Amino acid sequence: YTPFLANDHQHIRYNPLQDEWVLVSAHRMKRPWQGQLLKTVPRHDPLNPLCPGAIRANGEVNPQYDSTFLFDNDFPALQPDAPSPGPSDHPLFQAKSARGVCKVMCFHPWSDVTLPLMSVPEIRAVVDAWASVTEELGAQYPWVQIFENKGAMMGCSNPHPHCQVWASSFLPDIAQREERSQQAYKSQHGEPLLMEYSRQELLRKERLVLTSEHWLVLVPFWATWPYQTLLLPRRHVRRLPELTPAERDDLASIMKKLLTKYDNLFETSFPYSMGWHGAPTGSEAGANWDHWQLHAHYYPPLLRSATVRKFMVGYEMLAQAQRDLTPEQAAERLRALPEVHYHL
Amino acid sequence: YTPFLANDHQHIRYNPLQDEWVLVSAHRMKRPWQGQLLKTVPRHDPLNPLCPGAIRANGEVNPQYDSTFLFDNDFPALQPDAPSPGPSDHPLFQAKSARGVCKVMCFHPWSDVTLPLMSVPEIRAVVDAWASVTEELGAQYPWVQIFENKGAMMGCSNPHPHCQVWASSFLPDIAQREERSQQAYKSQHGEPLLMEYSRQELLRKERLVLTSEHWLVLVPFWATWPYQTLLLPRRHVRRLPELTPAERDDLASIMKKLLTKYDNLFETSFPYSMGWHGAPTGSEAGANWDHWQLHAHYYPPLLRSATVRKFMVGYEMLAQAQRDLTPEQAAERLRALPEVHYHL
């Protein structure tokens, strides 16, 4: 193999998983006309409705929980209402009925911890809870979407460590795109798309970030956010509950290392959105889904410092995604960072 | 016809132009844990490289221009380099060579004006310049993308009134999606997609914002940003240079009214990204493009006030777009706003 060189002022790269192209402008500079107060988080606040013992907006009191805690969102985007007909059927005005369940999942009872500061056993409890909620809601819904939205820069105003889980009657757009691409690849090549992608990136080396006995982390060839990563198991695994105890402990360990590297990059608590994608569940869960491979995406906004971010606007809203930093530059910088968390 | 009622806690709506679905959660509330210095802009600053008479980063001096001014971006995402082979051809590592031209276009020589504060003749000069650059760059490139990125909230640090123009050797992803959908609709129905959409929204009324002799503005059925609009001509028109003098004056007038309504909504200078989509140009410009209809999109982030915005993150990055405010609520509020600009 040969490295992918930065020998042009612009080229385009393909995302085969979601079927889109990215414009890459290597070595492009910036000369902005003008440039672009963190109060300490108490360990317990009785007025924070994610804390043990606190009152929520529906009037219920949280228990004195030990590790994770799951509850129904009091302001939910989806609710388990009775089936009903589709409210509109004209070619240009198409609408369908929908239903679902939205949960909040606290990671830990203390508000002043984040995942990279938690111990490996504390993170294993999070992994076990992710598997449990996927089993439970997947019995009734074809798509269960676990996601974490971390930091004020992502619009998250409550600093307590947590994620959300939205299960839906419909397969969302991105899940449909990943179903189509993975199915077509397996029919043509006889192997799952992301198993072959893992094999090739291990041989090419230059986009790897971390490797462990059971997992790897890399910056995808087609990444759109500056320090975006992809996390996936080395074994062929369709859904999160299939992970063995050893695979779950190793996932907790490699997540701790990745998220500590992310905090060390600009010596700040690193914001992002992330989530998990696995084979659809629901009434067709027993069908053939061998084309699927479980994986997680991380989409972080920071670009050059704790204050200098990427804005996905303008040409990226009217035409297609664009980046300056190459994926090979990003991965090189991430590999070099220590796994010991910085201290002020 | 009958209004589209807000009678459920959730449903999904289809975008037939870009082929995607949106989750709509009518009447959903928010209870955030915590909540979410504008210096005066001088009319002329010799150190602002968009002003008449100022020195730019390449050392050249801007002329004393009268209305619009066009120049090559000194930090360009695309450059007109010599054709070259594609740097990679494996199924999972696909890349193609690319080339193009990036311009900056100042709207006016004074830095302390924005479009809604400009006169109708001043805005007509902008329309004429948009037509001219589309003709000129479309002779060599199949896609010319005009876009305006307005406001610090969109990452624009230079407050001088301006847009950008990026012409590319490739057809970008969104243009390919709109080519596919418009072509399929015309083959099946015998009329252009957006001409039929205009006809139906004029009959249904409830998503209209402004109507004039030659144009209309509406909130699309499938809109994703809170006060998103679509602007298009009433006549079937494939590309911007085809607009007649009367159509160009009327475009200047209706843009002034829309952007003044937008500023009046939260009594602030309203941020957004916008741009124009028309039939592809370049070497195939003479082929049959009757399925196309010229149009512009506006994508603004503000939701409830000058400080409270929508974040397209989390579930929207991992699954699909989601909104609380309905398109019918948004359009109703926009219709009621005065066309006289507010004053502090």
Ligand SMILES: *P(=O)(O)OC[C@H]1O[C@@H](N2CCC(=O)NC2=O)[C@H](O)[C@@H]1O
């Ligand atoms: P993260 O910030 O991603 O999610 C926290 C969620 O908690 C919901 N809340 C807040 C307050 C309350 O009393 N009940 C509740 O469910 C909030 O809407 C966020 O989605």
Ligand SMILES: *P(=O)(O)OC[C@H]1O[C@@H](N2CCC(=O)NC2=O)[C@H](O)[C@@H]1O
């Ligand atoms: P808007 O803020 O959308 O675009 C302004 C563009 O101007 C470019 N500049 C800035 C300074 C300079 O000396 N030359 C130049 O081309 C800047 O990169 C923005 O894209």
Ligand SMILES: [Zn+2]
């Ligand atoms: Zn995925």
Ligand SMILES: [Zn+2]
């Ligand atoms: Zn369009």
